Amino acid sequence: TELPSPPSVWFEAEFFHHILHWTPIPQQSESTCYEVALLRYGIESWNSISQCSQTLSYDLTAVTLDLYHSNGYRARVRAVDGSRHSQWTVTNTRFSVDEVTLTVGSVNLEIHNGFILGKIQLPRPKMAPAQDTYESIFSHFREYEIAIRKVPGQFTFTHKKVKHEQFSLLTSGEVGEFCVQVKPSVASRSNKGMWSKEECISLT
């Protein structure tokens, strides 16, 4: 008779995109919604961001801008229907820079000499202070994994690794097209990354 708490709450961050996520209480009625609440680690003060959300994800980037200067956060979600509510279900872990998934803005390819130059525009998110560029926060140890595919070819790849947003790739001449993807990281940290959207370049 007393509403069920949401099974689990968790973050799905990316450089300024700290969306919260949760799973629905079983038998969720068409009138039930959820309440999203935050907490700046260091102050026993929970702040209610949302009173009602008929979604299973809320974007908390804006109230978590200090993420990369703070010591994490704690979110928690609650189910609401009529006068009753479900116990709060807090995030299992603290939300810091640790859990942010490293992605990359894009990659442009230029076919030169007989080699290919490529610069990696890091991500530039709208809701991101000027004082906080991907380079500021992550000043040193930016490495990338590069996967190059050939076409016409088979769905196979060559793997390389660099330490700057501008790399090159020793070309042998004989191909009709190359495609590349990147995956960033910071050696000092264990943050997982995400392979960029494929960016092909015709050699012909």
């Binding site: 907490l39 680690y41 260091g42 704690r74 299992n92 872990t93 640790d98 050696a187 940290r189």
Partner: protein, 142 residues
């Protein structure tokens, strides 16, 4: 110097495999490691602070834990080795943990003295005047 970046990571990795088991429990949410420690770190007691902290985490903290939550035993120990292992690679590149290293000159000498029996006492006391000329030399280095 040695392996700066990497060894840091090898460390956080040992933690990612435990971050949960422990963050689950943590209920009160006030910062223990107050930024004041980051101040002793940005200070001259910096080497002491860091050494006192590692001393803290491998003797008090983890020990009382590995046992406390047995199911955690195996992994706390793992982290607590990447720590032991960081200490070394650290108090090697002298530039970082000098307060944990020990002078060879002081040993060579401490050696000579031991291999001079009853006489070692005399020469030691006879050069103390120089010892004082050194200590002063050390003070002008400020």
């Amino acid at each position: 110097c040695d392996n700066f970046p990497q060894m840091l990571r090898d460390l956080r990795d040992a933690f990612s495999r435990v971050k949960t088991f422990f963050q689950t429990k943590d209920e009160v949410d006030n910062l223990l490691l107050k930024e004041s420690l980051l101040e002793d770190f940005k200070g001259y007691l910096g080497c002491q602070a860091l050494s006192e902290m590692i001393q803290f985490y491998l003797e008090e903290v983890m020990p009382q834990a590995e046992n406390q939550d047995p199911e955690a035993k195996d992994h706390v120990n793992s982290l607590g080795e990447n720590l032991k292992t960081l200490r070394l690679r650290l108090r090697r590149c002298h530039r970082f943990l000098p307060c944990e290293n020990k002078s060879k000159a002081v040993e060579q000498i401490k050696n000579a003295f031991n291999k001079l029996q009853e006489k070692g006492i005399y020469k030691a006391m006879s050069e103390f005047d120089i010892f004082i000329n050194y200590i002063e030399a050390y003070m002008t280095i400020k």
